[PDB]
Write a protein that binds this ligand. Structure first.
Ligand SMILES: CC(C)(Sc1ccc(CCN(CCCCC2CCCCC2)C(=O)NC2CCCCC2)cc1)C(=O)O
Length: 259
């Protein structure tokens, strides 16, 4: 790992720490000992303290709206982060849009793992914790949203990545040269090759104990693509069949023509 590649890995790590409100160290500090949402009573209490304006509709629909707000926010964070990736800001604007379009939910579900344990997830900028069992207790189809994400996260967390790894993994997610509709595939593939090269060398240095960590992470990227495809299908069912579950226009555009 040359000085330029080590420097690039650190540059991406610092951009991640700057641009995402939550990181794995911060999440672990909080989780070690947030208001616990484990039933309808505590959900309603948390709404009045953490999202007061929202309740100043069915609980499931209220949760869905709050989730959309966090997704919109995360799109902003990921867009700023992408500027630290060598060559991203030099791409055609349309290609930057396409890469973020397909990458954002893969990145969201990867980063969600940092705030998940087997019992639930940290939410609302670190100020709430919503139990996995409470989410399973919601009426269909809303109880079907988070469980596959918990399943992904438990195995992803067993890899014991830190933020220096996760930042590069998120950058690699964004730099996929095989997204549909790309204009300058050749330059993107070169951008992808560079980020993946940095990721491979970083994992060799930071995880000398796990000689297969790089191919494990390539597989996780493929798993995330499938998780997002399935997630988009469920969101389409909810939007179409739930008269009160309208989609924020920015998210409508992200999901539109995706899969
Ligand atoms: C909205 C769909 C249509 S479905 C969908 C998508 C994502 C999620 C996870 C949302 N969430 C819980 C947000 C829970 C808010 C809480 C609800 C109860 C009352 C207090 C506030 C959360 O913390 N996300 C992190 C954000 C920081 C970066 C990593 C991801 C849930 C459903 C979509 O976007 O596709």
């Amino acid at each position: 790992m040359t000085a330029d590649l080590k420097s690039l890995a650190k540059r991406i790590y610092e951009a991640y720490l700057k641009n995402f409100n939550m990181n794995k160290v911060k999440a672990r500090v909080i989780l070690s000992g947030p208001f616990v949402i484990h039933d309808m009573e505590t959900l309603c209490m948390a709404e009045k303290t953490l999202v007061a304006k929202l309740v100043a509709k069915e609980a499931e629909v209220r949760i869905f709206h709050c989730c959309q707000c966090t997704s919109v926010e995360t799109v902003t964070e990921l867009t700023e982060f992408a500027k630290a990736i060598p060559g991203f800001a030099n791409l055609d604007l349309n290609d930057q849009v396409t890469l973020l379009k397909y990458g954002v939910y893969e990145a969201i579900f990867a980063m969600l793992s940092s705030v998940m344990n087997k019992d639930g997830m940290l939410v609302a900028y670190g100020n709430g914790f919503i139990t996995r069992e409470f989410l399973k207790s919601l009426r269909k189809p809303f109880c079907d949203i988070m469980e596959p994400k918990f399943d992904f996260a438990m195995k992803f967390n067993a890899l014991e990545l830190d933020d220096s790894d996760i930042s590069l993994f998120v950058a690699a997610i964004i730099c996929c040269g095989d997204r549909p509709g790309l204009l300058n595939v050749g330059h993107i593939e070169k951008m992808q090759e560079g980020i993946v090269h940095v990721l491979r060398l970083h994992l060799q240095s930071n995880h000398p104990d796990d000689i297969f960590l790089f191919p494990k992470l390539l597989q996780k990227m493929a798993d995330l693509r499938q998780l997002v495809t399935e997630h988009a299908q469920l969101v389409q069912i909810i939007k179409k069949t739930e008269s009160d579950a309208a989609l924020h226009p920015l998210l409508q555009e992200i999901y539109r023509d995706m899969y």
